[PDB]
């Protein structure tokens, strides 16, 4: 399996380790791990275009979007490659992430290797919020923690 | 030109930003930037195999070595792909890095995207130290700071 990992860090208490596994290069990516230091509820969760951490999470740029589409949820045809939707933190502040996605890859043009995984302040509205922002970022708000996605063993 | 960047951090004071530019795939990669908080002198500088920051610099693994060769200097035919040799810190603790290398790439099999750049405590002996450690790490010692190499604009 190609395997990857992103270690999320930010200026606040949010931190975690997200694993990626893709046993077959033409199959889906499994995404799992823990994020702690979160407020309870839903948090936007995306792969952004750049693996650039020179100005914290800001320099990651927008959502990874090689096909130049509008923001959506991961179940939508109209989405960014990087749109993984939401993760859910429990009342103890821990999101135990478990996602499977067939649009991102660990190889090829849709590869997220060397790109930044970001967990956001608020819920991703999945492009249904009735404004321009909904259609670019899902209104998920500010970037709480991020990590460059790296090749793992 | 693909571009990449690594932001180096560790537990101590060592930190910097390293840029990569490769105008042509199969052309040389230019490597430049600045690392501060170093002791004056030579410091080993390598791309390691994994972009895995879960246990700090230790989980980056060994030098990036897809051709299974012995450790060397960047001018040697017998080297690891990740062997970028030494960088030099002036008396104010700053290494102004400026390197061109044609063995690493920002794409293909020798791509360092998603892999960890590491700067070391001691000088790399470029595989000429006559012990077993020399042919693996160059006796560069401990890992002061590291960063996952990410895609930049
Ligand atoms: Cu995002
Ligand atoms: Cu090294
Ligand atoms: Zn999006
Ligand atoms: Zn080496």
Cα separation, A22 vs A20, whole angstroms: 7
Q: Does B53 reach chain A within 8 Å, measured CB to CB?
A: yes
Other beta carbons less than 10 A from residue B25's beta carbon: 12
Name every residue whose Cβ is closer than 8 Å to that of residue A126 and which is 6 or more positions away in sequence. Answer: A71, A72, A73, A76, A85, A86, A138
**In DSSP terms, which residues pair with B43 in a beta bridge?**
B87
Residue B145, judged by CB atoms within 10 A of its CB (0-12, 13-18, 19+), counts as buried
- Shortest distance between the Cα of B148 and any Cα of chain A, in A, equals 6
Place of tokens 């895609």: B151
Q: How many interface pairs between A and B have CB atoms less than 8 angstroms apart?
A: 83
Experimental technique, in short, is X-ray
Strands B143-148 and B83-89: unpaired
Cα separation, A70 vs A44, whole angstroms: 16
Cα separation, A5 vs B52, whole angstroms: 6
Q: Which two tokens stand for residue A87?
A: 């993760």
This PDB structure is determined at a resolution in Å of 2.4
| Phi-psi map region of B129: left, alpha, beta (phi>0 left; psi -120 to 50 alpha) | alpha
3-state secondary structure A10-48: CCCCCEEEEEEEECCCCCCEEEEEEEECCCCEEEEEEEE
Q: What is the DSSP string of chain B?
A: -EEEEEEEB-SSS-EEEEEEEESSTTSPEEEEEEEESPPSEEEEEEEBS----EEEEGGG-SB--TT------TT-SSS-TTEEEEEEE-TTS-EEEEEEESSSBSSSTTB-TTSEEEEESS---TT-SSSTGGGTTTT--SEEEEEE-EEE-
- The closest alpha carbon to B110, from B153, B149, B152, B57, belongs to B149
Q: Which two tokens stand for residue A100?
A: 């499977």
For residue B118, the CA-to-ligand 2 centroid distance in Å is 5
Catalytic residue among B43, B79, B80, B110: B80
Cα separation, B6 vs A146, whole angstroms: 14
Cα separation, A18 vs A20, whole angstroms: 7
Minimal Cβ distance to B54: which of A7, A51, A115: A7
Q: What is the DSSP string of chain A?
A: -EEEEEEEB-SSS-EEEEEEEESSTTSPEEEEEEEESPPSEEEEEEEBS----EEEEGGG-SB--TT------TTSSS--TTEEEEEEE-TTS-EEEEEEESS-BSSSTTB-TTSEEEEESS---TT-SSSTTTTTTTT--SEEEEEE-EEE-
- Shortest distance between the Cα of B130 and any Cα of chain A, in A, equals 30
**In DSSP terms, which residues pair with A118 in a beta bridge?**
A46, A146
The structural domains of chain A, ordered by start, are 1-153 (2.60.40.200)
Minimal Cβ distance to A152: which of B4, B52, B151: B52
List the end-to-end C-alpha distance of chain A, in Å, as a whole number. Answer: 9
């Amino acid at each position: 399996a190609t395997k990857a990992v992103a270690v999320l860090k930010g200026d606040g208490p949010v931190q975690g380790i997200i694993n990626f596994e893709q046993k077959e290069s033409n199959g889906p990516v499994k995404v799992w791990g823990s994020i702690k230091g979160l407020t309870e509820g839903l948090h936007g969760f995306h792969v952004h275009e750049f693996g650039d951490n020179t100005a914290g999470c800001t320099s990651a740029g927008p959502h990874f979007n090689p096909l130049s589409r509008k923001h959506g949820g991961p179940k939508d045809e109209e989405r960014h490659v990087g749109d993984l939707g939401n993760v859910t933190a429990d009342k103890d502040g821990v999101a135990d992430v478990s996602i499977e996605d067939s649009v991102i890859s660990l190889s090829g043009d849709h590869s997220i290797i060397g790109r930044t995984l970001v967990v956001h302040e608020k819920a991703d509205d999945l492009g249904k919020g009735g404004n321009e922002e909904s259609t670019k970022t899902g209104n998920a708000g500010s970037r709480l923690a991020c990590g460059v996605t790296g090749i793992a063993q």
